[model samples]
Target: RLPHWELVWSDEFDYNGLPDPAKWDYDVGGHGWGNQELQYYTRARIENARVGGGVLIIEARRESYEGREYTSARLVTRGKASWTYGRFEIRARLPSGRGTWPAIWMLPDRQTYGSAYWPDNGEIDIAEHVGFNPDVVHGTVHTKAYNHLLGTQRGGSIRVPTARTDFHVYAIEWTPEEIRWFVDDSLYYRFPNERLTNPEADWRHWPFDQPFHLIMNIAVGGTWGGQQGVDPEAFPAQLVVDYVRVYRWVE
Candidate 1:
């Protein structure tokens, strides 16, 4: 329905069972994902990830697994697909209880800029919700010149009272000029390509020019998600996703 946009890809979750392998992949691990998260990400495990009744259920359960106290799934579109600039949208209902950190985000598909991975490559967080912060959704962009490590990340947040109980659209419109974040069509933040004066260091601030892939996951008690301490009862939480759609600019 967006003007000047053409639908390019989408996952409506119409089928029941594992995620579509042709459109999704997995990031299997339990090493905290650099955030000291407690969940041991499982691969092809129906217990942690499954699709049924018209939704993708990414469940996080508390149990001993691979030396980790919890288990979860990190679904990704890394090798399956990557996009340079487009309108990306995800409709979902977040998980609840302290210690749950569910996120819908993206990372550079290839490391062509900067001196390292992560900040050097850039990250786009369309929506991040920590259970403890209830109903407060965040949108952030991290680059070498403005990353959380330096406490200079560019981002914003908004309160959505039904965030954990109802499905809402979390999206981003990314173009050559800027990236705007929204919640159910309500704009909350923006990070523009400044076109810095220093040509040699411009990439540090505008590394978003390249392609990036999508990632969706739930972390249990990480550096940020665990700030308020994880409530043991919060285990067996779930992040239910209704759909994911992408639209390319038609110019």
Candidate 2:
């Protein structure tokens, strides 16, 4: 049966300049975030991010600022806001760079992966793309036991015929029983417990039961994104986000 949820949160990106601080907060510094990315993630600033026209632009620049080579922005609602389950939506446009990997993801509210490390609190990658792939965008979940390094649970990819030329909505409907990922209302991946295991047990199940906050970033040349040498030509690249909104149960 098709599940229904209520609206929980959102950012319409209708302002002329700057994001609304009442609803958004900057994720400061480079947490490493464990991606080995090159961007030093910063929060609300004219340089890192700004709202204008009708789009929320998350810029990644190649200049020396605050003693960092690559200065970019990432925003989240960690302690300020979170949702356990619902319909997640992020409208965005990616950059043009060889090693650039832009991501819009969430970390478990409790985020208790290990005593202090990779995969403990678990993660749900609503949308992540490598500029090299172009039309192919990926959605995945990472946990202590299951991660990209250890064959993580990828929701799958949906081909975006015009990923760069135009803006598109990429989202996922997450429920206790399953997670259905979509691109512009078209279903691309339906991950269920039955698919995680071998042909015998059908082991895959929705492990994302806790509240998770949103993350938006443009990473260039590091571990995964930098697996190939940085395309210096693609310098000053950026991943654009039109808006990010959430929906959930009302009653």
Candidate 3:
């Protein structure tokens, strides 16, 4: 293996306090968020995104918001921050409950997708886990022409044990030509700039070239994730994240 890069930024969850405003913000309002997910998004007023005991917790409550039984936290480094190609790492434990969709994904710095919708802007599901299968995790990429319907895109995922019980590293190494996924520093998936669609006509359009921000959320019920059915027993769920760190290639 080749060694490269230096630490750019990281949150060790050292502070048992509020998430740094300069580093993160909430994605307010449920704006047809991809996956037909149900949950009225909100701003930075969530105790769900708290950091304590050396861990960052993104909790989801079954509380009411704006006449909606919505309760979940979405933290992002969008306008506050963005990063190009780099090695991104997150230590987390998946949530429990059927209908639960927890993810650590990336969106382009500037919305390029059609109608400002997903798949159109090209999505990178760096880390996604469902409640039905807690031990297995998924890593995928979505685009306009290759989504669940018209868009015929593809990605890689595998069943990784110890994911729910202990904190493990889930990450991606991105460059101009390729993207690789890993678990506990072990390579699991890789896709190069081949079989790739044209940027002008297709939606993928070399998305890695632009600055992409980070996202972590626990979505309850919708599309693919909801099809499995919901387990009402596990209410007030949560996706616990130990830390998030970014590193870049060294000069």
Candidate 4:
């Protein structure tokens, strides 16, 4: 641990009801979000999201809503809270069974980037667990020049045997020089901001200098998630968050 780090922001979910309105906002719609996902992201609805028993529950249920068969929530801190560089941590238990794809990720501040689309602004996935993969937790980063579409994305996975049954700390330490991902206290992935001497190398290959905000979502059958198809029996599943915290490095 970094002894000099200071707690900057957090949502412990100590009280029951909807999430704190002052900090979180919902991304509502079933527009696919470029992932071919099938869930209709509900807005401020208790059926899809809520806080209780000292935890934040983002549930995905089988139903017909807004032209989709599944309903879930995509919580964001885009306009409410954001940090340029800090240690982001979230203690959570992943959802199980095929068709479930839970993610704890970040995206560049839309306003700050003048509404630039994805990849152009970059993406930092602190944790992405797929039901088909069971206990494998993935840490990935996407840039215009380096992404899954190009088969050049940078990512890694760690086998957390208790991921679905128990809580685990998923975190990322971001700095000017590097970005590191961890599960519990163990480091599993690292990305460096090295200078590329190629004549074409530019921000497309390094677009993470700008600030990014947090996002938590439980998605249904999508491009990557639908690879193995969805399991209708696993309709009612949840991605539970014990807490989400941010810490700044202090000198």
The model with the greatest lDDT is 1
Mark the 10 consecutive residues where model 4 has the least summed lDDT. 110-119
lDDT (tens digit, per residue) of candidate 2 on 1-251: 35556667888888866667876777777646576777677767767688887878887777775656777877777766788778888888877777777888887777343353346656788888777666678878766556777775556888787876677788888776667777887788865544354455321233476678888878766777777766867767767778787998444
Candidate 1 structure quality by residue, lDDT tens digits, 1-251: 44688889999999988989999899999998999998999998898889989999999899999999899999999999899999999999999989999999999998888479889889999999999999999999999999999999999999999999999999999988889999998999998887644456587888888999999999999899899988879989899999999989986
- Model 4 spans with C-alpha error above 4 angstroms: 1-3, 111-116, 196-201
Per-candidate Cα lDDT values, in order, are 0.92, 0.73, 0.75, 0.88
What TM-score does candidate 2 get on C-alpha atoms? Answer: 0.87
TM-score for each candidate, following the candidate numbering: 0.96, 0.87, 0.88, 0.94
lDDT, candidate 4, 134-162, per-residue tens? 99999999887778888888888999999
Looking at model 2, which ten-residue stretch has the lowest summed lDDT? 198-207
Pairing residues by index, what is the TM-score of model 1? 0.96
Q: Which ten residues in a row have the lowest lDDT in candidate 1?
A: 194-203
Per-residue lDDT of candidate 3, residues 174-243 (tens digit): 8767788888877888767543544454445445566788998888777766778766566677788889
lDDT of 2 at 81: 78
lDDT of 1: 0.92
